[PDB]
Design a protein around this motif. Structure first.
Motif, PDB file in Angstrom:
ATOM      1  N   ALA A   1      68.665  46.846  42.586  1.00 21.54           N
ATOM      2  CA  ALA A   1      67.547  47.695  42.189  1.00 21.54           C
ATOM      3  C   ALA A   1      68.040  48.959  41.498  1.00 21.54           C
ATOM      4  CB  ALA A   1      66.692  48.052  43.393  1.00 21.54           C
ATOM      5  N   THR A   2      69.227  49.422  41.875  1.00 21.80           N
ATOM      6  CA  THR A   2      69.819  50.604  41.255  1.00 21.80           C
ATOM      7  C   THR A   2      69.951  50.426  39.738  1.00 21.80           C
ATOM      8  OG1 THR A   2      71.019  51.358  43.227  1.00 21.80           O
ATOM      9  CG2 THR A   2      71.895  52.029  41.084  1.00 21.80           C
ATOM     10  N   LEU A   3      70.452  49.269  39.312  1.00 17.48           N
ATOM     11  CA  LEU A   3      70.577  48.960  37.887  1.00 17.48           C
ATOM     12  C   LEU A   3      69.242  49.050  37.157  1.00 17.48           C
ATOM     13  CD1 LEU A   3      71.826  47.806  35.264  1.00 17.48           C
ATOM     14  CD2 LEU A   3      71.571  45.525  36.252  1.00 17.48           C
ATOM     15  N   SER A   4      68.226  48.384  37.697  1.00 19.44           N
ATOM     16  CA  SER A   4      66.950  48.264  37.008  1.00 19.44           C
ATOM     17  C   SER A   4      66.117  49.539  37.094  1.00 19.44           C
ATOM     18  CB  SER A   4      66.156  47.083  37.568  1.00 19.44           C
ATOM     19  OG  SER A   4      65.891  47.259  38.948  1.00 19.44           O
ATOM     20  N   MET A   5      66.325  50.334  38.140  1.00 17.49           N
ATOM     21  CA  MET A   5      65.549  51.558  38.296  1.00 17.49           C
ATOM     22  C   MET A   5      66.018  52.659  37.344  1.00 17.49           C
ATOM     23  SD  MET A   5      65.008  51.634  42.442  1.00 17.49           S
ATOM     24  CE  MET A   5      63.968  53.099  42.499  1.00 17.49           C
ATOM     25  N   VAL A   6      67.325  52.816  37.156  1.00 12.56           N
ATOM     26  CA  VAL A   6      67.782  53.857  36.237  1.00 12.56           C
ATOM     27  C   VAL A   6      67.656  53.385  34.786  1.00 12.56           C
ATOM     28  CG1 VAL A   6      69.555  54.254  37.992  1.00 12.56           C
ATOM     29  CG2 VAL A   6      70.209  53.479  35.722  1.00 12.56           C
ATOM     30  N   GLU A   7      67.508  52.077  34.588  1.00 16.69           N
ATOM     31  CA  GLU A   7      67.220  51.547  33.259  1.00 16.69           C
ATOM     32  C   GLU A   7      65.757  51.790  32.906  1.00 16.69           C
ATOM     33  OE1 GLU A   7      70.154  48.016  31.713  1.00 16.69           O
ATOM     34  OE2 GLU A   7      68.596  47.435  33.143  1.00 16.69           O
TER      35      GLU A   7
ATOM     36  N   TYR B   1      64.124  54.278  33.937  1.00 22.88           N
ATOM     37  CA  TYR B   1      64.087  55.704  33.657  1.00 22.88           C
ATOM     38  C   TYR B   1      64.687  56.011  32.291  1.00 22.88           C
ATOM     39  CZ  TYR B   1      64.507  60.748  34.436  1.00 22.88           C
ATOM     40  OH  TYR B   1      64.406  62.117  34.338  1.00 22.88           O
ATOM     41  N   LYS B   2      65.771  55.321  31.949  1.00 17.49           N
ATOM     42  CA  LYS B   2      66.465  55.590  30.698  1.00 17.49           C
ATOM     43  C   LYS B   2      65.629  55.144  29.498  1.00 17.49           C
ATOM     44  CE  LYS B   2      70.300  57.801  29.979  1.00 17.49           C
ATOM     45  NZ  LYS B   2      70.016  58.218  28.581  1.00 17.49           N
ATOM     46  N   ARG B   3      64.888  54.049  29.657  1.00 22.69           N
ATOM     47  CA  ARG B   3      63.982  53.592  28.607  1.00 22.69           C
ATOM     48  C   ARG B   3      62.886  54.621  28.347  1.00 22.69           C
ATOM     49  NH1 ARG B   3      61.652  47.581  28.809  1.00 22.69           N
ATOM     50  NH2 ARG B   3      60.654  48.537  30.643  1.00 22.69           N
ATOM     51  N   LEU B   4      62.292  55.134  29.419  1.00 24.99           N
ATOM     52  CA  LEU B   4      61.209  56.103  29.298  1.00 24.99           C
ATOM     53  C   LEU B   4      61.712  57.476  28.863  1.00 24.99           C
ATOM     54  CD1 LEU B   4      58.920  55.252  32.363  1.00 24.99           C
ATOM     55  CD2 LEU B   4      58.888  54.352  30.022  1.00 24.99           C
ATOM     56  N   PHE B   5      62.912  57.841  29.302  1.00 29.08           N
ATOM     57  CA  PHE B   5      63.472  59.153  28.984  1.00 29.08           C
ATOM     58  C   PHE B   5      64.905  59.060  28.465  1.00 29.08           C
ATOM     59  CE2 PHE B   5      60.697  59.195  32.676  1.00 29.08           C
ATOM     60  CZ  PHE B   5      59.669  60.013  32.249  1.00 29.08           C
TER      61      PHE B   5
ATOM     62  N   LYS C   1      77.173  50.112  29.763  1.00 27.87           N
ATOM     63  CA  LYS C   1      76.097  50.385  28.813  1.00 27.87           C
ATOM     64  C   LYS C   1      76.015  51.864  28.454  1.00 27.87           C
ATOM     65  CE  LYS C   1      73.009  46.534  29.951  1.00 27.87           C
ATOM     66  NZ  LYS C   1      71.602  46.156  30.258  1.00 27.87           N
ATOM     67  N   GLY C   2      76.803  52.683  29.142  1.00 28.67           N
ATOM     68  CA  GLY C   2      76.809  54.116  28.914  1.00 28.67           C
ATOM     69  C   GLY C   2      75.468  54.776  29.188  1.00 28.67           C
ATOM     70  N   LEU C   3      74.810  54.363  30.265  1.00 29.66           N
ATOM     71  CA  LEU C   3      73.508  54.922  30.620  1.00 29.66           C
ATOM     72  C   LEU C   3      73.636  56.053  31.637  1.00 29.66           C
ATOM     73  CD1 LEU C   3      71.426  51.625  30.922  1.00 29.66           C
ATOM     74  CD2 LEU C   3      71.645  53.138  28.951  1.00 29.66           C
ATOM     75  N   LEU C   4      74.862  56.318  32.074  1.00 35.42           N
ATOM     76  CA  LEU C   4      75.113  57.298  33.124  1.00 35.42           C
ATOM     77  C   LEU C   4      75.930  58.487  32.625  1.00 35.42           C
ATOM     78  CD1 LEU C   4      73.707  55.482  35.021  1.00 35.42           C
ATOM     79  CD2 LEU C   4      75.840  55.067  36.239  1.00 35.42           C
TER      80      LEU C   4
ATOM     81  N   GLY D   1      70.141  69.286  42.339  1.00 32.78           N
ATOM     82  CA  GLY D   1      69.684  68.787  41.055  1.00 32.78           C
ATOM     83  C   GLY D   1      68.244  69.166  40.765  1.00 32.78           C
ATOM     84  N   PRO D   2      67.824  69.021  39.499  1.00 34.50           N
ATOM     85  CA  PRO D   2      66.470  69.375  39.052  1.00 34.50           C
ATOM     86  C   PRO D   2      65.388  68.470  39.635  1.00 34.50           C
ATOM     87  CG  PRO D   2      67.661  68.233  37.317  1.00 34.50           C
ATOM     88  CD  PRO D   2      68.662  68.535  38.389  1.00 34.50           C
ATOM     89  N   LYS D   3      65.645  67.167  39.647  1.00 36.60           N
ATOM     90  CA  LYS D   3      64.687  66.191  40.151  1.00 36.60           C
ATOM     91  C   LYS D   3      65.409  64.942  40.645  1.00 36.60           C
ATOM     92  CE  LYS D   3      62.447  63.623  37.150  1.00 36.60           C
ATOM     93  NZ  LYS D   3      61.606  63.144  36.015  1.00 36.60           N
ATOM     94  N   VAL D   4      64.658  64.039  41.261  1.00 37.25           N
ATOM     95  CA  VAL D   4      65.184  62.743  41.668  1.00 37.25           C
ATOM     96  C   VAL D   4      64.580  61.661  40.782  1.00 37.25           C
ATOM     97  CG1 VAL D   4      65.301  61.017  43.500  1.00 37.25           C
ATOM     98  CG2 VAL D   4      65.557  63.450  44.050  1.00 37.25           C
ATOM     99  N   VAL D   5      65.421  60.881  40.116  1.00 38.73           N
ATOM    100  CA  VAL D   5      64.901  59.852  39.225  1.00 38.73           C
ATOM    101  C   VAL D   5      64.487  58.630  40.041  1.00 38.73           C
ATOM    102  CG1 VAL D   5      67.147  60.374  38.189  1.00 38.73           C
ATOM    103  CG2 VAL D   5      66.317  58.004  38.188  1.00 38.73           C
TER     104      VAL D   5
END
Ligand code: MN
Ligand code: MN
Ligand code: MN
Lengths: 302, 308, 306
Positions: free
Chosen positions: A124-130, A132-136, A165-168, A256-260
């Motif tokens: 789920a970690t992979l798909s959840m930050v993806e 987020y990355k798509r939207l932001f 994928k360099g998403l981090l 941190g500023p927020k939790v993704v």
């Protein structure tokens, strides 16, 4: 996958974040994820019946449907939208799990919710930050990763895929204590910061005050980061880990500023130690961790 | 004893430590010792199937037979020779006596040590500590031996206790007791009489467990670890549990501070499968804990020094 | 209740504190309390068969009858008064009020005979009757309770702690290890000016750095098993993860200061909820047996200093 239909239907039918919430963290959305784990996954249901008062003097409120009221500032309420179990009649594939998670997370995120995933194998970690990355695409993501294992020795590991994928923007691994040769290579290669158990212990676990950060954090928690005495229900236990209190303390230090998003995983009912009343020790430990994770989503700051 | 024949036969056929190991620590030889415990003794097998990567960034390599190549200093391998179970099940339904266990253990330790191996004994009731440091003292009469003993009990009120026999025979230079928390009156007397050093649970806890950085020592060290030194929450499978003990990580940390020129041997004992807390998949909690303790004990045999 | 008859009869016949105990702490009297818990209550019996040697080099001596000789060196006599409830004297379950009256009575009797009463088992209700028994006999003495609990336990008006606070029998309350504090709990804390040391706070300052709990008044020690992490004491009705280890508790207990102990209540243990080893010994019984022993030690060695 038709198995995720009733869940997905209810999730995209969720009332968007109200305007009363502006400038405030949250609200939080919660769902049950079961990829790579047995079909029967009781962690979500166990948490939902658990007490709602936190370590820090605040209280969870759990709702099955919206609208999610933003509580008065003098009220220490922390709303949680229960979206239920993703699966409700054959074991779905990992890709099907990936799609259901990506879809649910994307939907919740664009409705202003902080997604919290409970269960599964860590995929789920992979798909959840993806999601987020798509939207932001502009936002840089950092992951705080609690795990007995670095989990970067497999190219198919959720963490490795994200770094490939360099998403981090960055990764902070906490509590690692089975570090392979391959792990060390990827560590140096992707310049990961890590706080291994032995070093974290010899400095004084309570002496850890802050995990300094300026970017939105994703919180990924493998249950096996905890000592097998506190969390036995794990597929690959490594003795000599964190106590539940140790983990709570370090979690509380995350800045941190927020939790993704948050993914609590690695819990397998078939491997737990059970009381005579058939309550599992790991379910008890994780219910607490989930509750203080939710708190952190509502209280995090640089 | 005929029960140990197949084991003892394999042991003395073991390839001696090669010249490539000259002035290096190790290698390590590992065997299952079962005195005083139920016939079914899964700890060795459980350890053998456990992951090989350690806390500190090295990796065990296990071998059923020699020759044991000394690895280049740039590869962090730690060879372990699996000598298997001392008692061969289905070679008889006989329970070996205390003497037979002693003689078998004494001979295997003698064989391994003479062949340049650091012997590691896994299982049993603590009696292997006796036969293993006696095997060393035979071969190296000039060497002073110190033992770091992890135990919930001082275990020196019984004249027949493995540790008391060693002191009464004057084979030990010094003794460091760690984690004691059920100390009888007689234990106190024997403590002063033999001038033992000791680090009781309450004392080291109140001082700060992570503040233990070193245990200064210049002599070859034998490491004896009773599972009951751990809190029953981490190691329930013990005959005489005493609550308020070490966590697995506490023990690992203190082990890592052990100093000395070499390890003469390691005994990890006190595990009884009949008394464990089992997960639903029937894996024992104490086996999980000890398998980790054995791995890092082996790492100490390969990397021990006398500094800081 | 006739269920307590055999027990009470024996307690009333107990030999009073001899003159050799003059101006010394102790002796200690021990009994099994079973209110709110299942009929099968093994904690007392388990403790009685446990090893006698303590952390600090002292040794319990267990006696079934008086007189209790006052030792010169490191002996710590305990009078076993047995189970309050007598099985097979009736298959009837006593009521809360009956449990309270029986406990009040036994505590009164033991206290007036110069014993420090130690109650083992039950649901915490013994804390109510024990400090009331002491308050009756010594109305002038100020009492403070050191309360180990995952829960403040002051959100229920019926709770043993709040009844004492509303009746004004307590000089002060020190709560250790709370980690589920409700809105109601915080209100009562502020209102009654309770001192508390929550899990997250004492952990973050370093559990081992707690040297003592400063105090001048006689102390009642009330210990809920669930103050310990579920991994050490799983046999509790309302587990809260992130609690003390057995050694953490022992260390903090050892820091308790005061002129004397008015009593000790170790409760919260339900055998139906325990994690069991393969030989059917419960993890929580192992932990609490140790807690009870070092608790007895504190009643014999407590001083107001530092
Ligand atoms: Mn893991
Ligand atoms: Mn022992
Ligand atoms: Mn409680």
């Amino acid at each position: 996958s038709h198995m995720f239909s009733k869940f997905l239907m209810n999730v995209k039918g969720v009332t968007p974040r109200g305007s009363d919430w502006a400038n405030r963290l949250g609200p939080v959305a919660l769902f049950g994820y079961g990829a790579g784990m047995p079909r029967r996954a009781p962690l979500l249901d166990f948490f939902l019946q658990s007490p709602r008062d936190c370590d820090h003097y605040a209280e969870l409120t759990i709702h099955d449907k919206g609208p999610i009221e933003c509580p008065p500032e003098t009220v220490m309420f922390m709303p949680v939208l229960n979206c239920g179990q993703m699966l409700d009649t054959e074991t779905p594939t990992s890709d099907e799990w990936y799609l259901g998670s990506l879809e649910a997370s994307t939907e919740l995120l664009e409705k202003g919710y902080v997604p919290v995933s409970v269960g599964g194998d860590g995929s789920a970690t992979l798909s959840m930050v993806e999601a987020y990355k798509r939207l932001f695409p502009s936002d840089d993501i950092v992951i705080v990763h609690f795990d007995a294992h670095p989990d970067v020795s497999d190219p198919r590991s959720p963490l490795r895929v994200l770094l490939d994928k360099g998403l981090l923007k960055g990764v902070v691994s906490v509590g690692n204590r089975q570090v392979s040769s391959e792990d060390r290579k990827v560590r140096k290669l992707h310049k990961m910061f890590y706080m291994d158990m032995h070093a974290i212990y010899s400095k004084g676990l309570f002496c850890i005050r802050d995990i300094r950060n300026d970017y939105p954090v994703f919180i990924s928690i493998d249950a096996d980061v905890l000592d097998p005495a506190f969390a036995p229900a794990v597929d690959s236990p490594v003795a000599g880990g964190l106590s539940t209190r140790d983990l709570l303390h370090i979690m509380n230090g995350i800045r941190g500023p927020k939790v993704v998003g948050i993914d609590v995983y690695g819990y397998n009912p078939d491997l737990d130690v059970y009381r005579k009343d058939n309550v599992g020790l790991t379910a008890i430990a994780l219910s607490k961790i989930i509750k203080e994770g939710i708190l952190k989503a509502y209280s995090i700051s640089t």
